Amino acid sequence: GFQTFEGDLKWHHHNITYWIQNYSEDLPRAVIDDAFARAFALWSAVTPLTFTRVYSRDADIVIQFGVAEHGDGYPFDGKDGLLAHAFPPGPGIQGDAHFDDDELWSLGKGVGYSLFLVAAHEFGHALGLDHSSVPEALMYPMYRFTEGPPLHKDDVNGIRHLYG
Ligand SMILES: Cc1cc(C#N)ccc1N1CCN(S(=O)(=O)N2CSC[C@@H]2C(=O)NO)CC1
Ligand SMILES: [Ca+2]
Ligand SMILES: [Ca+2]
Ligand SMILES: [Ca+2]
Ligand SMILES: [Zn+2]
Ligand SMILES: [Zn+2]
């Protein structure tokens, strides 16, 4: 099922920091903060890691909303298509998560994309999981909106393989 990145890339400290560098206008800031906090809460429960929001460009996981070419050479593509991408743990751009602001970001059913669910998938990459071949795993690479708990056994097995 689960996959890791070449060399089992992982964080080497337990207290992970994140910085929300900018905001989409799609949702109130506190709703965006909450969407990302809830996506981290999903991974903190099943790992020895903690996630603290800081205001610093030195944060481990830097979160951006961007359109088209947004600074890393992996451009976004307008509405639908590529939704978001994240880099595996490590320094600098590594571990960062970027969200295509040409998407309509929502919390709800079927009106564009759930920022909470997309962030939960991208944060799995930013902790060192790659794509799973197990259908219904959070890390299985297709978007389907769900009201159910997003983590599957295969995701939890993957993250336990990396962090214990
Ligand atoms: C797999 C997945 C699961 C959930 C949930 N729940 C929410 C979102 C989610 N994604 C978000 C990321 N995409 S994506 O933007 O289409 N995509 C497919 S390959 C490159 C890119 C990707 O995986 N980014 O991490 C596919 C599906
Ligand atoms: Ca980083
Ligand atoms: Ca897109
Ligand atoms: Ca948008
Ligand atoms: Zn990017
Ligand atoms: Zn992915």
Whether 6 is catalytic is: no
Give the type of residue at 115: L
State residue 127 phi and psi, 5-degree precision.
-100, -10
Q: Bridge partners of 48?
A: none
Contact 130, 5 (CB under 8 A): yes
Closest CA to 113 of 104, 126, 122: 104
Contact 11, 5 (CB under 8 A): no
Looking at all shown ligands, the one closest to residue 96's CA atom is: 2
Closest CA to 20 of 57, 75, 72, 70: 57
| Nearest atom, ligand 1, residue 139 CA | 1
Closest CA to 145 of 116, 124, 122: 116
Closest CA to 2 of 148, 164, 162: 162
State residue 77 phi and psi, 5-degree precision.
-135, 25
* Residue 157, CA distances (Å) to 52, 62, 134, 162 in order: 24, 26, 12, 9
* Residue 126, CA distances (Å) to 62, 95, 161 in order: 10, 4, 15
Rounded-to-integer distance, Cα 114 and Cα 128, Å = 22
Rounded-to-integer distance, Cα 21 and Cα 65, Å = 8
Our mutation pick for probing the ligand 1 site, out of 80, 143, 144, 147, counting the most ligand atoms within 8 A of Cβ, is: 143
* Greatest extent of the chain over all pairs of C-alpha atoms, in Å: 39
CA of 138 to the centre of ligand 3 (A): 19
Report helix, strand or coil for 100: strand
Cα Rg of the chain (Å, integer): 15
Rounded-to-integer distance, Cα 104 and Cα 112, Å = 5
Domains of the chain in sequence order: 1-164 (3.40.390.10)
Q: Fill in the DSSP letter of residue 104.
A: P
Method: X-ray
Looking at all shown ligands, the one closest to residue 102's CA atom is: 4
CA-based torsion, 108, 109, 112, 118: positive or negative: positive
